[PDB]
Each structure stands twice: as C-alpha cells, then as structure tokens.
Symmetry: D4
Subunit: 163 residues, 8 copies
C-alpha cells in the first residue's frame, strides 16, 4: 500500500517522454508513489476511457497528462474522472506548442484542466503542483515540499557569472 | 430517408453556427440527423455515437465545437468514417483556439477541417455532399446545379 | 465555517469574471473568502496574504488577473499551497497577454492555469473542489452529483 | 482500369515533395491507385485550371493538394472541380506554416477545402481521409482501412522507454 | 476615358472597404472600372479578366478579398501588370488571414500588399496613382497637390 | 543616361543585404539600371530624408526598401517621396519577420507602401513588381519581362523527383 | 511654466488615448505641451520637433501612434532625450501592429514602450514623472503621494 | 561616492545573463556606475521586495530588469519602487520572447515599466535609455552620450558589401 500509486502520469506517445520525464523525476525526488504510462486519446480512446474512469477507485488522487499538437488527452481524461487533472502542453514542431497550449487550457466551464507551461518547465511544475495538492493531507510530504521550496530559494545566486 | 450524414455539436451555443450545415444538407435533400454531443460533458455519449455511426448507415460526420474543441478529433478516434470539423468562433480568441485544437491532428487520425464559423459549417455540408455525390448520381446532379447557380449568381459590379 | 479556499483578484474590474468562481464554491457549500489583492498596486498586501495563507487554514488559492497578470505567479512564489490562475479577458489582446503571463511559469513555482474568462473562473472553482474532495467525503459526493447533473442535463438535439 | 488513378496528389513545387511524399506512401500502402504531380497555382495557373476542370471526367474521386506560404493551390483547385478537395499546409520557413494554414482553411462558404495539419502529419492524414472517403463505396478498401486503423491502435505501447 | 486601373473585389461584402479605392481614383480623375470578381466562385471570370487586362489598356489592378484571399495572387498569376492587394478585414481573424494569404507570395509572382481594411484600399488607389504619375505629368501634378494638402491639413494640436 | 538609375534599393544595414541582394540580382537580370545603398531610418534619419526627398529629381522612378524588426525605413521613405515605394520585410531573429511585416504593411490611409513577402521571396518580388511598373512605359523591358514570366511558367516540372 | 514634457500623437484619432497622459501630467502639475505630429503625413514637422526638443528645454517626449506606428522610433532617431512610446489600439489588429512597430527597436536607438491603449498613455506620463522626480524634490514628493494614494485606495473586497 | 551605483541591472537567472550582459557593457562604456545582480521574482520574492523598496535610498536612479517566460521581475520591481523601471524581455525557447514581451509591457495604468525589444537589442537599449535619463542632470554624461550617438550615425556605411 506504501508503494501504491497516488499520481498517474500519462502521455500521448514516446515522443512526449522527453518532456514528461521531468514530472516523473520530480515525483520520485519527493518520494511520491506514481505510475507512468502511454495513453493516446486518438489512437487508444477506449484505453483512455477505462484509465480515467477507474483512476479514483484504483487509488489515484491526481492525474498529470501531457500531449502535443491537437492535444486532447488532458481534456478527455478530465471528462471521465472526478479527480483533478493537470495538463502539460508538449512543444510541437511547427507551432512551438501554441496549438498544444490552446487545445489544453481553453476548456469550457464545467470540465477543468489545470494547465502548466509549454515543455519541460510545465512537466516539472505539474509534478510540483500535484505534490502541493497531496501535501494538504500528507504531513510528511508537506515537510519535504517545504524543504524543497526553501532550498530552491536559498540556492539562487546573488550575481551572475560574467565569465 | 435514413440519415447518411450526422451533424453533431458540443452545445446549444454552437447551433447558431451549425444550423448553416443543417440548412445546406436540407437544401440538397440529403437525409441527416442533427444532434448535440459534448466531448467533455457527455464523453460516453460521444464514444457510443462514433463507434456505432457506420453500423447505423452514416457515411459522413460533421462535428462542430469551440474553445478546446475536441469533439471532431475524438469522434474520428472511434470511427472509420470521414469526419469533418467546424471550428466554432470563441468569445476571446475568435476561434483560433477552436481551429488549432481541431486541425492539428497528428498522423493516423484525420479530421478534414473547414473555416472558423458559419462559412465552415456551410462548407462542411458542401464537402459532405461532394463525398456522397461520388456514389449518388442524382445528388451529384443537384450539387452540380448548386455550384453552377453559385457561380452564375455572382454580380459583375457592386451596388 | 472557516474559509478553505481564497479567491483573490487584481481589481473590481475582474469581479465580473471571478464572480463565477465565487458562485460555484457557494453552490458546492465550500467555505471561502473573496478579496481584491493587486500584485502591482498592493504588493505588500499580496506578500502578506500569500505568506500567511497556509497558517490561516486555506487549502487552495484561486487568483484572477488581466493584462500583465502577475497575481497568480507571485502568490505562488510566497505560498506552498496550490495556486490556480484565471486569465481575465483584456480589452485589446482578449486575454492572450493574461494567459501567457500566467501559464508560462518556469519550473519550480507552479500555477495551475484555466481558460480565459468566465469559463476559467468556473473551472478554477471546480478544480479547487476536486482537490478538496480528496479528503472530504461529503464534498466528494456533492461534486459527483454536480458532475453527474452536468452530464445528464446536456440536451440530445438543438432547439 | 484497375490501375486508373482515383486520387490525385498535386503540389506547388519540388520543395513540397518532402511533405507530400507521406500522402503518396500511405495511398500506396492501402493499395489506392493515384497520380502525383506538380501544379503551381501561381506559375502554372492554366495547368491548374485544366487539371481541376477535367479531374472528374478523368476518373478522379478525390484531390489532395499541398502548398506553402500564400497557399492558393487547394482553394483554386476546389473552385474548378466538384470533387472533394483536401488541403495540406506545407510548413513555411518564417511563419512555420501559419500562413499556409490560414490561406487554405479559411475558405468562405460555397467552396470547401477539407484541411489537415501543417506538415507531414497533414499529408499522411489527407491520404487517410481520402481512403475513408473511398472506403464508403469500396468494400475491399474498407476492410484494409479497418485493419490499418486496428493495427495502429494495437501497436501503441503501454509505457514509455525510460532509456 | 478608357479605364487605366481596374478595381476588382471578391464580393459585395468587400465593397464597404473597396469603395475607398474607388473614391480616391475618382478624386484624382483617374479613369477606372470597378467590378466584382470572385477567385473561388468565378474562377474563369478571373482568368479571363487578368489575361486580357493589358490588351484592354489597363495599367494597374487593385484587388481586394478577405479570409483565404486568393484574388490578388491569382490575378497576378495571369497578368504581367502590377497587381496591388487589399486584405479585407474578416469577421473572426480581423484580416490576419486575409493579410497572410495575400502578402506571402513566393518569389516569381508579386502582389504589392497594402494595410488591412479601408486604409489599404485608399493606399492601393494612391499607390496606383503614383505609378501612373510616372508617365502622366498632369496626374503627377494633381498627386503632388493631394499629398501637399494632406500634409498641410494635419492640425498642430488635438481638439 | 542609359546607365542612370531608375530604381533605388535601400536597406537599413549590412545584415539586410543577404535578403536584399535578391532584388539587386533580379533588376540586373532584367537589365534595369539601379543603385543599391544602406540607409538607416534610425541611425541616419537625415540621410533618409534627403534620399527620399530628392529621389524623383534624381531620376528614380521606384524605391525598394528593406528593413527588419521595428521596420520604419519603407514607411518614412514614402512619407518624403511621391514615388511608389515597395517594402520588403526582413526576417527577424525572434519574431521571424512578423514585427517587420506589420511595421511595414500597416500604413494608414494617405501614405502607401506596397509590401511583399517576408524574406528573399519578398526581395525578388519587389524587383519584379518594380519591373512591371517600369514595363508600362518601356516596351523593351516589357518584352524582357514577358519572356521572363513565360520562361518561369514553362520551366515548372510536371512531376516531383521521388529520389 | 515652460514645458518639460512633450506629448505628441499621430492624429486626432489618437487623442482619446493620449488624453490620459495629458490628464496625469496636469494632475501632478508637470508643465507640458500636447501636440499632433504625424511621422507619415508631417515628416519634416517631426524632424524639426525632435531635433529641437532638447534646446527648447524638454526633458522627456511621450509619443503615441497606431498601426505601422513610427512616430516614437523616428522621434528617438533625432533626439538624445528619453522617448516613451504608447501603442494606440488599432481597429483590426487591436494594437499588436502598434506594439511591435514601437517596441522592437534595434540596439542603438531606444524607445521605452508602455502598454497598448489608455493604460499605456497613463503609464507613459507616470514614467515621465518618475524620471523628472530624480532631480525635482517637490515633484518627487507629489509622485510619492500619488503612488501612496493609489495603493491605499484599492478596496479589500469586490462590490 | 564616485563609484556608487546609480543604475541597477537585475535579472531572473544566470540564463538571462547572455542577454543582460549587453546592458552591463553599454553602461560601462558610457562610464555609468552600476550594480549587476540576480533577483528572481518567483524564487526570491522577498529579495526582490527588499531590493526594490530600498533602491532609492541606496542611491539608485534607474532599474533595468530582465526576465523571460512569465516575466514578472520588471513589473513587481516597479510595484515597490518609485524609480523608473525599464524592462527587457528575454527570448524564450518556445514562444521566442512573445510571452516575455506581453508579460512585461502590458502593465495596467498606475505602475509603469518602460519596455525595450526582445533580446540583446532590448538590453543594449535599456542601458541607452537609462543613460539618456541620467544625462538630463549630468552634463558630463550628456556629452559622452551625444558623442556616442553622433559616432553611431557617422559609422553607418553608404553601401553594402556585396562580397
């Protein structure tokens, strides 16, 4: 039960891994049990439906979904689960993730997707946001998160390295 | 009499736009159904609709949605039938979000996308008609007449 | 009775948008506070609000702002609590400036961003509710009912 | 007659081939007889007029047209043929295909162009869309398309390769 | 009396914009014709118009269109005469689609593009006038007067 | 007098030459006498004022101006000359010429700038447009232009090289 | 009494926007002149104005323009004084053209750019005030009071 | 006192140095005493608050702030100081600085940030703008600035190097 996943990281394809691995790494650093899978809204719609519908009963508390282009994975996941869904816009080749961003963040009232920045920063922040959500009812994790945020602030240099 | 084209839209708010597709199909006497199906509010309704479309006799699906428009793409994910998407104009981004969320489908699952708004709805219907005309001589003739009237009716000078 | 969600907005001009978040939380019976906090006009008020949020018992912060929207990001800089941002539609750029200034946070300080405008405000409230529902069974049940009613209420055909 | 082309793939120039070859390959994979030509709306307007006007009588059922920049090939082809025309926005150097996309998709009511994604994905999907159209009256092709779509779904991995 | 400039537009809906070009040419006493020619609805009408323009005595063609604006570019494909394009403001994308579809012509077939809307129509007429003025002394003088009056009429302070 | 320049090609800086050289080459190919200079609207405003004001008296008939970023050269040239001014948006590093394009094409009613495409294509077309203007009163050039356009059309291949 | 700030705008149409800069300077009792100067219609008027600004005693120039907005940049080309630019909202592109044409000045000739519209005009005046306050103690005090009142006047909750 | 900084150059991170070094170099060239530091609005908000609040009392007259992405450093600095704040949008990876630009320039009425161009040009101009502000009450610097601007104008070539 201590190893049971509480966060699910899903992505449309292997090409999205270069970006989503940043979410995986952060969750591991904060000792947050999670699962990482590939789920395509367009190629495996039934797999997505089943995954999202059963997420809560399986013990998941937060879902982090990443996709690029006509990015529908986060939005459709949210349509099937009552759990909070965080979306990461994967940078696209031509439109640099603008298509990914608008397709994820512009959800109409009624079905939310908490959206993060385009790319690696967004993936890392999706993990951090998930951690902050979990920290609300996990004192141990809250402490680890506090230490992490504190270290981040303390590690900022006062002046740049002018070579 | 059975519908051969299905027009689906995310919500009642999309009707002002999608009614143009409905009117066109009726004008060309193409049997069709016009329904509301929300990818985000009624995902199971969408899955069932798209999955069973072919069996029910539908040949083409015209889907309209605005904002983070996922209806056309998800419909295409469940059916082998041609899916045409109409980006509905959104309040803030004027349909740019609708357009990109519909047209940028990665390789493997297509959605033939039309223009933002009423023009797109009308054209989705005309495109569906041109598809059906490939195997329906009578309709092909009516479509030819429609296109001919459109061309001949353009004035030579402004009023 | 103590607030568990704090809704903050840059100015009175943002209320027409943020009132949708307020209405939703009230509908779901989620105790909350609704205030005006300007990142640019009242920076110290913001620092104090964000810094003390956790101690005061708040669990989630919903922040709305338009233009060079910095309220959500700066709130997140001072609190460990989840911060959700709502881009308020701006006059000229229709919220594109609001959206980019809120969603593009670099790694290390997150802001869960929702859609531009009213939809975003409503969704920020719903997202906050889904977060609280993880440790509040009664609310979880009310949220399930809310989502179920939304799905069941969608019409099958346009009027 | 079994080799007679039923789909015509036309492109503005040789530079568009890198993109349009994806449509050609897909049609061949699905055993769909087709022709692939270069037709410039701006440099060979009369060639385009003749091609589009005679497409139907020549046996073509669908036209896939690709162009970049001020992309007019798809739209003008549609102005002269009653056949369904699918357009592929070729990525441009400066505007990354945004000019190509808007110049193709924003056709006013009356003359349609079913538009696909910018680049290679769009070319592949134009071919797939054409196949789905042809499948409506070709049982053999419909079967091949069904198998293709099914294989696509079955070939999606469950988890990413984390190196 | 024979027209030396041809103003063509996609449809009646473009007249509110293109009338500004017509008014300017008339003010400068430049003989011209004003017609409707649709690249998409009347492609053969366009081909004939552009192909025969030079023979008919036209020196410059001013073409206006909105959305997927192809009229200017296709006119230029058929004539050796200078073609000036006016992007008509579109409903959703405010002429950005019109602008890119007109100005981004690849090397080999030019279209001198003006601003979106009324300003562009007025300037297309003025640009045509500046072209004609190179070989028409009388017109050159009237154009000089027009430009001089424009400069001299600008107020020194706002009211 | 046969060597006297009838077209003036001006650019904001040496960095714009990579783009504007395409206009220079085209004019030379069509045997159109011209001058090519660097004139900065922002660094040499008085040089620009003098150049534009005296262009007509010096015999110039058309001015082709190229600039990038906050591109003001074409517009300000047009403010001082009654001659037709053609503008070429030079591609910029960050905004890919979108800033160049809007700063040149969006001239208000009263002071025109015939704008061409972003980059090399625009430079080549500025030269071609200038040639078409000059051809209206130069039978010899009109003939050369006709031959050039005809050759362009005849040189388009019928099919792509599929390697 | 002599003006230390010059507010210039392309045309009367820019006054609705630039009047906000005028009002602010008057409120802070900063002597200034408000004029119309068109970079495109009155280029020589602009050259003279910018060239002689310093000699006339001006310390800061606030320039507003829309569309292909060149007034601020060209003013900066002729004067060593700090030039602040205000992008006026345009009809079609909502000031995006104004903004890029003003802010994207290459290295060597700066223009401190403010937001599109009224906010930008007000801020250009405030920025000019903050500049003058560096060497004018009395004004510095009035500016401090202005900023303090702005901060203190923000309500704590929406109405 | 002659070495006391009158301009403060602050940036969000080391990654911004490649851009902001251009402001540093220009100020040094014009002999303007200044300090260059790293201050993160998001990672060190209290450091920013203290820096901005005490800037005036410490003798600073102008603050040049650079940041990228959701760039809040310039705006928040301006919220705490009465001094003029100039902002430099650092080019971002995906959106090429468009997110940086809008997040800095779109300040509402009441709290100004004089914004410069995206990237290196903006950094150099922020320094030049700061110099022009200081020159208003520093005759010696005004002379150096006049000479600098004059040299810039005189150094512009009349024609491009056509290789």
């Amino acid at each position: 039960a201590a190893s049971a996943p509480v966060v699910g990281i899903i992505m449309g394809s292997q090409s999205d891994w270069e970006t989503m691995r940043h979410a995986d790494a952060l969750l591991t650093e904060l000792e947050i049990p999670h699962e990482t899978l590939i789920v395509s809204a367009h190629r495996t719609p039934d797999r997505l439906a089943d995954y999202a519908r059963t997420a809560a009963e399986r013990g998941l508390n937060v879902i982090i979904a990443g996709a690029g282009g006509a990015a529908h994975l986060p939005g459709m996941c949210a349509a099937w689960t009552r759990l909070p869904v965080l979306g990461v816009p994967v940078e696209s080749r031509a439109l640099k993730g603008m298509d990914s961003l608008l397709s994820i963040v512009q959800m109409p009232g009624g079905v939310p997707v908490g959206t993060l920045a385009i790319g690696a920063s967004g993936a890392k922040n999706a993990a951090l946001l998930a951690a902050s959500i979990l920290a609300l009812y996990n004192p141990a994790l809250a402490a680890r998160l506090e230490t992490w945020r504190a270290l981040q602030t303390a590690s900022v240099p006062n002046s740049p390295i002018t070579e």
